[PDB]
Amino acid sequence: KLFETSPFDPLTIKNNQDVVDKLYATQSSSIQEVVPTKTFATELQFGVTS
């Protein structure tokens, strides 16, 4: 078996964002290069609204 847990099921997805979301859900099984944690932001701007 190539994968102990499949990266994603090809039949379930319908667009590209579905692929992106599925990888984030199944990345726990994968041997991650950098494990996910709380993200740190360095730039943040708010534009005026209506």
Binding site: L2, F3, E4, L23, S30, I31
Partner: protein, 51 residues
Amino acid sequence: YRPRRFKEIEHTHGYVYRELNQGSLLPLVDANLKESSSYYFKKLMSSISNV
């Protein structure tokens, strides 16, 4: 190494079906495996029993 002998009847009147297509692994191999390499890595480490 040489193969063992079958029965005499299977030698005089024996017929076997076979296929000669070895095949190739290129269709599976040829791809951008950047995203899918780590799952294969985990399966590879799970293949060999440790501890």
